[PDB]
Design a protein around this ligand. Structure first.
Ligand SMILES: [Zn+2]
Ligand SMILES: [Zn+2]
Ligand SMILES: [Zn+2]
Lengths: 130, 302
């Protein structure tokens, strides 16, 4: 299997990521997921409000990737490897081999955080990690 | 010899390979006549071809058995994804006393690893064929619709994928496994020509042309570092002027990375020749490595 694909929707994926990297743009998070019955990544949502807001868009039936910028000095970049509690174990296993390729696609990931409930996404704990 | 067919994993009358343990139903090989004497199975014959010096793959020509073993170790590591515990160590008879009554040829990722280390795979096909024992045996003992069987399908699919990467380019593969400083910018011994690749709805993008098949080229994109097919017919040799015109910032990053690559190619081989605007990429192009672009008869850098 080719695995995760970034071909279809490439422009949307990089446009969200570029918005997150830009200091002038308000948005500081983007959320990606797979298209149904496919390994092609698509943009699910994006916005402002950082980790607190982003944790509100995670879905329990999906594998998703959250790219959030976190700042008083230069910003660092978190990739949330989200696997919903209702994702089948086999698909968790297959998707696990994509994470590195996703981090390579969205250049500049500073830390990868594995998550299956919102409670795994503590802004403090992530901050101390950086 | 195995009692269960290699293709459908069911019993019944089968043909027995003479070299390996596997067995096949005639129906499952889609045979059209009966084999005459000693029979070698498709896995053995594929391997025999892939390991013959006169018919080995371009990746195998340039690898020794030891180097390939190192790449295989990396592939084993990619197969041990989180969730694969049931296949990392041989099945204990204490957990399943009847196991040997069904599995003629056990296999696990640890054994794959040790065998790779003992340099007993002469080609990537050898390796994936040995790996498939894990799945075959899973289906036999747990059934095709088991959860574990779903995991074993994932690890055999990762295995296929990594074998293919190694075969596309061993040097690319190793540099991507180690991920040293600017690993994407290291030229390979036979350097892939640099091109403007184009996907639907995305601007022209600097890329490595890794291979051509039936009007497509397999481009590995600067910046993002993934690979995808793009039509040969809108692909152009790298130039100073872009074929058209977007998403400026990441593009400038990718350009910088490509320019580092160009500098490295100039230090490794002595040349890198930019093309005129919109020069169409051709298969097996050599223009970029010409000692004198004015005068192709001088040849290319060795
Ligand atoms: Zn069969
Ligand atoms: Zn055989
Ligand atoms: Zn290469």
């Amino acid at each position: 299997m080719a695995g995760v694909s970034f071909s279809g929707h490439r422009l949307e994926l990089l446009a969200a990521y570029e918005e997150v990297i830009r200091e002038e743009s308000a948005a500081d998070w983007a959320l990606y997921t797979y298209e149904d019955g496919s390994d092609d990544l698509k943009l699910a949502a994006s916005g402002e409000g950082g980790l607190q807001e982003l944790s509100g868009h995670f879905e329990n039936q999906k594998v998703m990737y959250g790219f959030c910028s976190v700042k008083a000095a230069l910003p660092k970049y978190v990739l949330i490897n989200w696997v919903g509690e209702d994702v089948p174990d086999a698909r968790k296993c297959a998707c696990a081999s994509h994470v590195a390729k996703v981090a390579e696609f969205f250049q500049g990931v500073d830390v990868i955080v594995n998550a299956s409930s919102v409670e795994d996404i503590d802004a403090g704990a992530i901050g101390q990690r950086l | 010899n195995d009692f269960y067919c290699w293709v459908c994993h069911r019993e019944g009358q089968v043909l027995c390979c003479e070299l390996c343990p596997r067995v096949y139903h005639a129906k499952c090989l889609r045979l059209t006549s009966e084999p005459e004497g000693d029979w070698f199975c498709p896995e053995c014959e594929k391997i025999t071809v892939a390991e013959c010096i006169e018919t080995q793959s371009k990746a195998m020509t340039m690898l020794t058995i030891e180097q390939l073993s190192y790449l295989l170790k990396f592939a084993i590591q990619k197969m041990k994804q989180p969730g694969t515990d049931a296949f990392q160590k041989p099945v204990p008879l204490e957990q399943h006393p009847d196991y040997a009554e069904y599995i003629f040829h056990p296999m696990d990722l640890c054994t794959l690893e040790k065998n790779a280390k003992k340099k007993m795979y002469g080609c990537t096909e050898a390796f994936l064929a040995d790996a498939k024992w894990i799945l075959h045996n899973c289906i036999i003992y747990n059934g095709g619709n088991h959860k574990l069987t779903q995991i074993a399908k994932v690890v055999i699919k990762i295995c296929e994928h990594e074998m293919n990467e190694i075969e596309v380019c061993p040097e690319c593969y190793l540099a991507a496994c180690q991920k040293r400083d600017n690993w994407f910018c290291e030229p390979c011994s036979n350097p892939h020509p640099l091109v403007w690749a184009k996907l639907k709805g995305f601007p022209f993008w600097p890329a490595k042309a890794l291979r051509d098949k039936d009007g497509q080229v397999d481009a590995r994109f600067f910046g993002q570092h993934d690979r995808a097919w793009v039509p040969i017919n809108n692909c152009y040799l790298m130039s100073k002027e872009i074929p058209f015109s977007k998403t400026k910032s990441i593009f400038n990053s990718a350009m910088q990375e490509m320019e580092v690559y160009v500098e490295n190619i100039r230090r490794k081989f002595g040349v890198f020749n930019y093309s005129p605007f919109r020069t169409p990429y051709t298969p097996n192009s050599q223009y970029q490595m010409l000692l004198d672009p004015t005068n192709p008869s001088a040849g290319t850098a060795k």
